[PDB]
Design a protein around this nucleic acid. Sequence first.
DNA 1: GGGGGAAGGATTCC
DNA 2: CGGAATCCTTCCCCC
Length: 341
Amino acid sequence: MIVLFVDFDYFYAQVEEVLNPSLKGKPVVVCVFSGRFEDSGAVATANYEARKFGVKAGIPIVEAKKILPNAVYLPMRKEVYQQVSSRIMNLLREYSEKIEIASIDEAYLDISDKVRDYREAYNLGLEIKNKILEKEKITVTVGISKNKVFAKIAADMAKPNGIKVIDDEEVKRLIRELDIADVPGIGNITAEKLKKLGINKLVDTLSIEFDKLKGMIGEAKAKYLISLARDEYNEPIRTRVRKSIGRIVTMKRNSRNLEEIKPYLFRAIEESYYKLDKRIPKAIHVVAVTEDLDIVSRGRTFPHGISKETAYSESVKLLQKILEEDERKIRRIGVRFSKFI
DNA sequence: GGGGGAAGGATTCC
DNA sequence: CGGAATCCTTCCCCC
Ligand SMILES: Nc1ccn([C@H]2C[C@H](O)[C@@H](COP(=O)(O)OP(=O)(O)OP(=O)(O)O)O2)c(=O)n1
Ligand SMILES: [Ca+2]
Ligand SMILES: [Ca+2]
Ligand SMILES: [Ca+2]
């Protein structure tokens, strides 16, 4: 089995360099402005020029501007990158439509029938890469190996504009020396827990007692890591696609006034519906970040689809429910529709 | 003991 | 001082 992975280099930031090439060679920074008055928000992504001075994804627009006050800060136009994305995905769609669209800028292609041997697999990466760069001037990185996870790791290493193949022997070595931190689906909050239990690499997950792990990193993530350490990992390449659509916003101020929140909630719904389109959702969740930035969401699953009218209808009580079981001040508020039909 | 789901909490950037 | 989703663990009715 040979899986070819593709990941768009600094996607958002880059796309903006396509619609306005004057920025390349310059620090570009895509941002999300909340509006709770100026500079407030976060960073979505930053090109490499920007990254090398400390500007990464996740930092407050203010702390970033202290590093590059002369950098270009563009608000995020997700709808744009989305289209640009779909294009690169449909182009890929046929190099093996036994492909999985992981995210707005990720995909997995099972090139088993379409080819064998890495040599060729590689030569089909520049092929794929070359095409995308030509047809859309976007630089991407490719990963190749026996399974999805490792294919990604190959790409994550040689980025950007890279193409790396890490098959069989190297796999063993990574299972031995790769840093647990760097394992797909292993964020910060999971990496440290993992050090505590004395694990810093994949292989180490075979020395610890299966229970200590479920005990801490959840039976879910637990089985995952072990499976990898035994290079007994294998999950087909099947386009697994979106199972929830929502919209969340920041109230100009924090509060517990039902009639003050209501408007943002009704704006979130309205937009969620529009983005839902023809897809009919059977479950609805009212979400609201507390000021200590926690996440409390009260939902519901009907035995049938939700008409916008109903969305409005239940959204209110789910919201009333929340206030009714928590206490904190709701900073941001929204809704999320799932269980489509 | 466990299927089958709905619900609420946490985590990753999937 | 963001925003979108997913992941995942506990609760629940009941055969
Ligand atoms: N806290 C975060 C983290 C990431 N993203 C966005 C940034 C990108 O728009 C998208 C994909 O980011 P990746 O990390 O997968 O890849 P990058 O876009 O960062 O490029 P690169 O992997 O080459 O660094 O996720 C976000 O909105 N908020
Ligand atoms: Ca990327
Ligand atoms: Ca990515
Ligand atoms: Ca990591």
